[PDB]
Ligand binder design. Structure first.
Ligand SMILES: OC[C@H]1O[C@H](O[C@H]2[C@H](O)[C@@H](O)[C@@H](O)O[C@@H]2CO)[C@H](O)[C@@H](O)[C@@H]1O
Ligand SMILES: OC[C@H]1O[C@H](O[C@H]2[C@H](O)[C@@H](O)[C@@H](O)O[C@@H]2CO)[C@H](O)[C@@H](O)[C@@H]1O
Lengths: 388, 388
């Protein structure tokens, strides 16, 4: 005989399974199925449903996915269930271990409004069926809509050494680690095994930075698409002031990156050895008042006023293969490393265009060398004296 | 008490749910499961089955998938359920709106025979597990088998203006929009947010055009594979005369495109700024009678006879990187724009080969400039006077 004390549960009196409690009847089947993992369902050629379910979705966490409801905690919970990285860690060994966990794929098929910077832990693949392209109304992806606009929508994890030898996750928008920081332990990257396929990210007007790709060595992107072609007034367009900011990401590859921006498209700083940006399509949403934008992250030698599609400095040498740059005051601003002019400006066959022939310079090169191959496409601006 | 009138249903007497009607028993469960969406099946770490099922297949529509039965209506239904765009539209706002719908991924794992041109609407991702490569018998993909061979197997959507001011979907096999048409309003593209991975397309012998990549700005492809390596006799092979025809597709990228053709491999016309074709493997199925093939779509300046692997004109300047071209009479035929010679012919390290050393010319250049990098692979024809 089996004695069951008052206040018992099947789980607390032997569990449910062979030799213990066995579910019987329809009510129990309903709950067994509803609270299971799919193991009750057989599949072909053999095995059970759970054996083949590996993707995660915000819907599993009840995200509304309409770009209205605040789905922040749902997205964070989804991320946490994959790899929950505490914001404070004791030492190097502790932060490094979070890059040695199981990686999981996430599929974003609706529109998720969020109001706090999302930090992607290592071991994450994010996918969306297709990439946005001058999309007027974003329907699938992330919509960053915070109270504090002096922030980034998305950011990789980089831990900063504290006075007591402990490490705290960086949450400062303007911060980016240097190759030196990574060498001397002042910063420790917690960004690895991250893959993006078609992530669409829109932003409330005025948000400072779209994506902070910091410390992402070996991390990859394909079809990453930033910004919304909301309307003619860029001042209300749902796109960030700065599309992407990248540092300490050697060996990182961005395939067919798409960026709709207001102030700066993409910025690459310090160590990014061997990193490539292929077939990028970077455009200011029209060039109205473009010449009045003020670059936010720029080398000291660049003091000119005007929007910049691509900015690079502090020894960064990203390879730009066949980029398409549109509607920019400055297509490229590049500075060699202050100390020795290190960092070759490499642009192969750029497709440069701007409505009404409005432009300041295509290649603004400071204390540097370069190898550029022209493809019979380009222009110089309307000022007969200053534009070149 | 609850009174239920004769001829009632649960829906007509309060609905199903808390505070109303609740399903009870095995029979109810069987029907709920059969007619549901997976919501009764829990999965890990939380949520239900419906939350993670996002991919569509033709099997959901009972397609036979054997390459014999005509699965046309079922492929069309699957496409329509994703984005059902009317063949006739009121104005531009109307057609533009269809590029702002939720995108869906389709997985093709069997062989689907169809008999009318398939029009891929915006917001569609297509994937097949692997790409065909000189495949003798196509097992997975699409097989176009029409009564009228003067047609295209697959086409993107471009709307043509009508005398009354309305717009109609183009169904003319030879039509392609120009940059001028798009600028005009004469044409409005409805091809955006389309991604193709490993799509295998074979066609009945005699089919004019395999794929009409028109207006596909920012659309991408990887492993698109056209044509079947049926047998030694090309007149009987399951491949089209013209593999791919592209126009108005600036920023479109074709990665590792594979084409087996009879007349012309790929054709690129008019505005295609910044578009790239990487590691294409284009080959006529042998060169037997290749010299007699007459190019269908080509510039006026080209009047020679012979098959052409790659044809480009009207100001199109697609970048061809590491293409592999085999058994062609003419590897490339390129004409700069009539008015100002615009449109640089760019080919980087082409791997050119032809059986028996049979060939007319590799680079037939008309009213144009070019930058070509040779990789120590190539040859010139057997005519000691004309071939170069
Ligand atoms: O030597 C490193 C780098 O330091 C300064 O860069 C600034 C930059 O000007 C700001 O826009 C922002 O991004 O912070 C950076 C340093 O944290 C110098 O101005 C620059 O020339 C130099 O390369
Ligand atoms: O000015 C554009 C273009 O017009 C003609 O191109 C023809 C082509 O010859 C045909 O094969 C077919 O594709 O229709 C095209 C447009 O009607 C000229 O022959 C060509 O040279 C010219 O660049």
């Amino acid at each position: 005989p089996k004695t069951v004390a008052p206040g018992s549960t099947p789980a607390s009196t032997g569990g449910v399974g062979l030799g213990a409690w066995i579910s019987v009847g329809d009510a129990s089947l309903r709950t067994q199925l509803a609270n299971g993992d799919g193991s009750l369902i057989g599949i072909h050629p053999q095995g059970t449903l759970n054996n083949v379910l590996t993707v995660r979705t915000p819907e599993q966490y009840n995200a509304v996915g309409d770009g209205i409801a605040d789905d922040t905690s749902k997205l964070k919970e989804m991320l946490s269930d994959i790899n929950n990285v505490p914001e404070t860690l004791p030492d190097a060994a502790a932060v490094n271990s979070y890059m040695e966990q199981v990686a999981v794929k996430i599929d974003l098929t609706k529109l998720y409004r969020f109001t706090e910077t999302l930090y992607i832990p290592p071991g994450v693949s994010i996918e969306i069926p297709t990439s946005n392209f001058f999309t007027r109304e974003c329907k699938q992806g992330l919509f960053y809509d915070p109270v504090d606009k002096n922030t980034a929508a998305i950011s990789l994890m980089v831990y900063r050494k504290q006075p007591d030898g402990s490490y705290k996750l960086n949450k400062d928008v303007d911060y980016y680690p240097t190759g030196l920081d990574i060498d001397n332990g002042d910063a420790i990257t917690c960004a690895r095994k991250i893959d993006i396929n078609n992530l669409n990210l829109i932003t409330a007007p005025g948000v400072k930075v779209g994506v902070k790709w910091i410390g992402g060595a070996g991390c990859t992107t394909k079809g990453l698409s930033i910004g919304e072609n909301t309307g003619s007034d860029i001042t209300t367009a749902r796109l960030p002031r700065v599309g992407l900011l990248q540092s300490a990401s050697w060996g990182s590859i961005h395939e067919n990156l798409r960026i709709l921006y207001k102030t700066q498209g993409a910025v690459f700083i310090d160590s990014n050895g061997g990193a490539a940006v292929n077939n990028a399509y970077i455009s200011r949403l029209g060039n109205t008042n473009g010449e009045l934008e003020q670059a936010v992250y720029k080398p000291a030698g660049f003091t000119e006023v005007g929007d910049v599609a691509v900015t690079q400095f502090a020894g960064s040498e990203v390879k730009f293969n066949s980029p398409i740059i549109e509607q920019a005051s400055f297509d490229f601003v590049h500075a060699g490393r202050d100390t020795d002019s290190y960092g070759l400006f490499m642009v192969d066959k750029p497709h440069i265009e701007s409505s009404g022939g409005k432009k300041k310079h295509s290649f603004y090169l400071i204390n540097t060398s370069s190898n550029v191959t022209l493809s019979g496409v380009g222009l110089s601006g309307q000022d007969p004296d200053l534009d070149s």
